[PDB]
């Protein structure tokens, strides 16, 4: 049980925060619990949209929130009717009065969280783990990326003995503090139990 989170490790560089807003002492804890409330619903809802990140900027009673998706449609809605439901369901949580932008993911095949969830799902549907994994690494590796790697937890195939599956291609330097490796974790509830899924994608460097 070693190695740090590849993101948290690189936060100073090659990776910005998910919530970039000043605050302090009396507020910070309140102004943060909120962010979690926010993210809470978005992930509980926008699942089929393909969640990947939830930036949350601030300045004062005019929050940001910039959900990133693979299928920006599912988010918005018909003509923009859903972005009405949510955007409203939002203030019924934070009187704060906040926006709700939506950026599209340029190739969900380079989004560790996505590749992860991608695999997490297949596994839930009962696909061959090792296959799903190799495939995933291929997709990711086959559409850009200077390196990728996926890891599935254990009880592969519902086996009584928890195992751990691999798969990796090209440089994926977890040690190099400047790599720019996207990390993504996906759960996977199952008849037999939870099985975590980890996706690592390497892009450029400097």
């Amino acid at each position: 049980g070693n190695k740090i989170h590849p993101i948290g490790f690189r936060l100073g560089i090659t990776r910005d925060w998910e919530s970039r807003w000043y605050a302090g002492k009396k507020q910070y804890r309140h102004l943060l619990l909120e962010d979690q409330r926010i993210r809470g619903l978005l992930e509980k809802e926008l699942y089929s949209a393909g969640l990947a990140r939830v930036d949350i900027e601030r300045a004062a009673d005019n929050v940001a929130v910039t959900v990133h998706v693979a299928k920006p449609g599912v988010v918005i809605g018909r003509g923009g009717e859903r972005i009405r439901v949510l955007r409203e369901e939002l203030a019924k949580l934070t009187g704060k009065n906040v926006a709700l932008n939506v950026q599209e993911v340029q190739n969900p095949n380079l989004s560790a969280p996505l590749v992860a969830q991608r695999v997490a799902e297949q596994i839930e549907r009962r696909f061959a783990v090792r296959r799903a994994i190799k495939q995933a690494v291929q997709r990711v590796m086959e559409s850009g990326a200077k390196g990728a790697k996926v890891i599935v937890s254990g009880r592969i195939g519902g086996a009584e003995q928890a195992r751990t599956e691999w798969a990796a291609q090209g440089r994926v330097p977890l040690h190099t503090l400047r790599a720019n490796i996207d990390y993504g974790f996906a759960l996977a509830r199952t008849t037999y139990g939870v099985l975590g899924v980890k996706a690592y994608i390497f892009l450029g460097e400097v």
Partner: protein
């Protein structure tokens, strides 16, 4: 950390000395930092994700 034992939010301390922090995410009453409302664990989990604004990794 049983729903039942999260009566901490009940205010009604009858006397304010019966009040107690509790994690605002897991209920981990054990190690809860004030500045975050989070316990030593969650604080570490979130710091790794970047969801803790301007909370980088220390070193010196």
């Amino acid at each position: 950390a049983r729903k039942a034992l999260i009566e901490k939010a009940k205010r009604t301390p009858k006397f304010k000395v019966r009040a107690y922090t509790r994690c605002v995410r897991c209920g981990r009453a054990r190690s809860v930092y004030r500045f975050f409302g989070l316990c030593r664990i969650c604080l570490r989990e979130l710091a790794h994700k970047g969801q803790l604004p301007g909370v980088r990794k220390a070193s010196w």
